[model samples]
Target: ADWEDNMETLNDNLKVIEKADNAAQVKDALTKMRAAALDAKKATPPKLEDKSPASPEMIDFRVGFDILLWQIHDALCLANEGKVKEAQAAAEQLKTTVNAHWQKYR
Candidate 1:
């Protein structure tokens, strides 16, 4: 499924961000992550298979991803400024959000 495919890429890119030693690497991964997130926006999670695209659950799911995307963008911004430590620190916070949401959706 497209959702699974995109999510797989997203998950992979997240690791790239975690292991990145340079800003360029982080930027590349975050770019892919953003694209994957946008692609996955309309796809329903298997855990919530019964939910409609327009349903509140699905809406929240998409919105939650948007929140994640923004966080990623923020990290990228820090990376762009050559703040690798701060970017990694921000990425650490990302795990909290990911853990919270994936518990319900993944």
Candidate 2:
């Protein structure tokens, strides 16, 4: 029940970001949402923190990378299914998204 509640809270916060009109508003809402999630997660710590310098950004990137892999895999599967244009579009979008996030490290 606690996990469900946490997920609901996160979904509601994400809706706020979805409704945000500009990048600044979205950024603020995301920061608030992240803080809430972090607090909730800290309330029940995970089994491990393997990274030496486990910063918030690193955590975000780790999560994002996992999701991106799923997206890319799906796109590649679609390409295999003969949906060339759609798969190409999805792959390009993933690439751009990855580059955009990767810039945060530089």
Candidate 3:
């Protein structure tokens, strides 16, 4: 009955990434994102859907996005170790996955 508190749109995450300069910031953002997702998991989903995408399918997207969330973690870990180039590569990989996810956006 109070799950909206945990859910968030993709925009929220992108906003967090925009000004992030260190692993701590990104990690903090990820923690927030995960918290919201936990809320979402408990919320009652809408019956109607655009093109009627199934709940599981929708969850699939969220679950898939979680992978990118951790990819950012890898980026941060690299940064913490002074591997700037490797950190950038991990971030680039994260970006690539997100781009690919939206390739069919209408």
Q: Name the top TM-score candidate.
A: 1
In candidate 2, which residue pairs clash? none
* lDDT to native, each model: 0.79, 0.49, 0.54
Model 2 scores worst on lDDT over the 10 consecutive residues at 40-49
Clashing residue pairs, backbone N/CA/C < 3 A, model 1: none
TM-score of each model, in listed order: 0.85, 0.46, 0.51
Clashing pairs in 3: 6-36
Which sequence of candidate numbers ranks them by lDDT, best first? 1, 3, 2
Which portions of model 1 miss their true places by more than 4 Å?
A: none
Question: What is every candidate's alpha-carbon RMSD to the true fold?
Answer: 1.7, 13.0, 5.4
Instruction: Summarize candidate 1's per-residue lDDT along 12-86 as a digit string, tens digits.
Output: 877777888988888788788778878778688777788766688887888998998899789889888988878
Output the lDDT of residue 74, model 1: 92
How well does candidate 1 match the true structure, expressed as C-alpha RMSD? Answer: 1.7
Best lDDT goes to which candidate?
1
lDDT of 2 by residue, 1-106 (tens): 3423543454454455445444444445445444444444433223223544466655665566456556555654654565555654564565565455434432
Lowest-lDDT window of 10 residues in candidate 3? 1-10
